[PDB]
Amino acid sequence: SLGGQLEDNWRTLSEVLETATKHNNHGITYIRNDATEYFQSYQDLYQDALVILNGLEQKGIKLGHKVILQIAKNQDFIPALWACFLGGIIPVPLTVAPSYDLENSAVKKLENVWKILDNPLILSDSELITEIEKLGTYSHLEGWQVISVNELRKAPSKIEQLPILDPQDAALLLFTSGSTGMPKGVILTHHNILSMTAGTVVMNHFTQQEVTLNWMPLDHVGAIVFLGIMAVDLACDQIHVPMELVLRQPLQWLELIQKHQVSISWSPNFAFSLINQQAEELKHVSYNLSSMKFLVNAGEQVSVKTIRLFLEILEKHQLQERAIKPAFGMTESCSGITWSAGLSKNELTEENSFVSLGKPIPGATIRIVDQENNPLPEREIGRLQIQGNSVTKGYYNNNELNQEVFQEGWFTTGDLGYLSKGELFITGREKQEIIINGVNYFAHELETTIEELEGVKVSYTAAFAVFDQSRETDLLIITFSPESEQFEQGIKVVRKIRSHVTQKFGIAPAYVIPLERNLVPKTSIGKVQKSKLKKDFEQGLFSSRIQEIDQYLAK
């Protein structure tokens, strides 16, 4: 149903980095937690990567082998990632766990992936090395080996020549958590990654003069590719900020855009809302954001009302018209695959209620089909299917999954939406629909509406529907985290949530469950995974709290 013509490029990642070294002008600027800065030119990165690569070789890690990445320090992660790229070693970046002595999904993912990949070596930093080894000994994991990047930097560097690689060979393996069970390992070739890069650059007119800024964790595809490898491909300046720095003080994102004259940046929808929360203090200070021309809202459903408010607040801070770029992407397509032309605030009205995520990059084709795999007419909801050189060819060691989601040269994303004049509009995700009396409801709207309320902490909210067997009816369940200091003072807001939702939508939440911030399940990028919360409810993990709240009501 779509298009885009792109000339074949047969570069590898090593050639891309080698091309970038000539521009000793540019490279990576690392922002530390204390807001100090450290510049590493592409030449320095290349030299650093070679040293680490030699360290890897000396430990017996060979071409084609896989290594797990568990590195929180950005100054260690990127050089180690590129080290693997140059040596033909496949890096497997995984989310750094919040702790390694307590039960969490990140610890489970690390152990599961480790088992799937036949006991590969784990790369860490000096801060985390001890904790990760402890987990290995405590859980008696046979062959568990962890090494710091700084120990690999010590390797007497007997550097030999770099291997010549096939761009069709695997270069990057990224595991995503599925709805249930084992994680899914997305295989990404050089050709996959560089075909996204080329398509995105040509379509959006990026040049070596760009300044990219990332504040998402480096294990995610958006940070590795769109705001990592792309910048290397362009040989432009790239900046990496730890997520917690911007979370602790959201306005620092705006400060860094101004200070570094940033032209390209990205966050999911919730972070836009976090800025909107700062509307008051944004009246007493002024930022200059005129350098920002490509501001990506991607990673989760985009809220019309949130974007509209974001423009109104920040146009008073020199944010140019059409700078905001809602986009669609996934791990399976090396992040971004469609890009908006920009928002003009005229599509944002009590409008749609769906934001356009734009047209696909050159080389890519997208379509909306029915259950029969037949293309549907424009403007009606169906399953999104994607193809092109930027799209993955298959998952790691999972034929059952490959045969299901890869058919006729198309990949089923598991996402729902429609096409209108060539532009993609995502409406929801499969098996997460909120249907009550045949009427379609949309989680993001509900969540946005909830998050307007005082006492509801932004980015910890979820809305989903379960079927109640006893009463033979569908229930709307709302989970949130209180903005109180602290819970359980967030009992007053439970009542406030139910009424506010009824007033605006005409339907009510059956249950409203407050949650401790640390227990709301989130992907590395901060997207609330509603599947894990649905399961938790059906156990039920919250039954005690539900009763306790119900006992507090009726008094």
Question: Which residues of this chain interact with ligand FA5, rule CB under 6 A?
Answer: 176, 221-222, 226, 266, 296, 298-302, 326-331, 335-336, 357, 413, 415, 426, 429, 523, 525
335, 365 Cβ separation under 8 angstroms: no
Q: What is the dihedral of CA 445, 177, 545, 487, to 10 degrees?
A: -70
- 129 versus 171: smaller Cβ distance to ligand FA5: 171
459, 493 Cβ separation under 8 angstroms: no
- 83 versus 188: smaller Cβ distance to ligand FA5: 188
The DSSP string of 258-274 is: HHTT--EEEE-HHHHHH
Q: Report in angstroms the alpha-carbon separations of 447 from 153, 273, 279, 409, 463.
A: 47, 11, 19, 36, 6
- 123 versus 426: smaller Cβ distance to ligand FA5: 426
Q: Identify any residues that bridge with 295 across adjacent strands, giving them in sequence order.
A: 265, 324
- 221 versus 456: smaller Cβ distance to ligand FA5: 221
Q: How far is the CB of 333 from ligand FA5 (least distance, A)?
A: 8
Q: How far is the CB of 547 from ligand FA5 (least distance, A)?
A: 34
Q: How far is the CB of 411 from ligand FA5 (least distance, A)?
A: 11
R_g of the chain computed on alpha carbons: 23
Q: Identify any residues that bridge with 475 across adjacent strands, giving them in sequence order.
A: 466
Q: How far is the CB of 549 from ligand FA5 (least distance, A)?
A: 31
Shortest-Cβ-distance residue relative to ligand FA5: 329
Q: How far is the CB of 249 from ligand FA5 (least distance, A)?
A: 23
The DSSP string of 285-298 is: S----TT--EEEE-
- 88 versus 299: smaller Cβ distance to ligand FA5: 299
Map 433-492 to HEC letters: CEEECCEEECHHHHHHHHHCCCCECCCCCEEEEEEECCCCEEEEEEEECECCCCCCCCCH
Q: How far is the CB of 186 from ligand FA5 (least distance, A)?
A: 8
Query: What is the rounded CA–CA span in Å between residue 482 and residue 454?
Result: 9
Question: What's the DSSP call for residue 519?
Answer: G
Q: How far is the CB of 546 from ligand FA5 (least distance, A)?
A: 29
Dihedral-angle region of residue 237 (phi above 0 means left; psi in -120 to 50 means alpha; beta otherwise): beta
- 336 versus 521: smaller Cβ distance to ligand FA5: 336
State the sign of the Cα–Cα–Cα–Cα dihedral 254, 257, 263, 265: negative
- 226 versus 464: smaller Cβ distance to ligand FA5: 226
- 21 versus 265: smaller Cβ distance to ligand FA5: 265
Query: What is the rounded CA–CA span in Å between residue 231 and residue 217?
Result: 16
Map 307-345 to HEC letters: HHHHHHHHHHHCCCCCCEEEEEEEHHHCEEEEECCCCCC
For residue 19, the number of C-alpha atoms closer than 13 Å in the C-beta half-sphere is 15
Q: How far is the CB of 244 from ligand FA5 (least distance, A)?
A: 19
- 266 versus 272: smaller Cβ distance to ligand FA5: 266
Q: What is the dihedral of CA 323, 324, 329, 331, to 10 degrees?
A: 90
Q: How far is the CB of 193 from ligand FA5 (least distance, A)?
A: 13
- 14 versus 389: smaller Cβ distance to ligand FA5: 389
Map 6-64 to HEC letters: CCCCCCCHHHHHHHHHCCCCCEEEEECCCCCEEEEEHHHHHHHHHHHHHHHHHCCCCCC
Write out the two tokens for 106: 């990140």
Q: How far is the CB of 19 from ligand FA5 (least distance, A)?
A: 23
Q: Is the peptide bond before 27 cis (omega within 30 degrees of 0)?
A: no
Q: How far is the CB of 107 from ligand FA5 (least distance, A)?
A: 19
- 120 versus 326: smaller Cβ distance to ligand FA5: 326
Q: How far is the CB of 327 from ligand FA5 (least distance, A)?
A: 5
Q: How far is the CB of 194 from ligand FA5 (least distance, A)?
A: 16
Q: Report in angstroms the alpha-carbon separations of 178 from 84, 184, 413.
A: 26, 6, 12
- 21 versus 448: smaller Cβ distance to ligand FA5: 448
- 21 versus 385: smaller Cβ distance to ligand FA5: 385
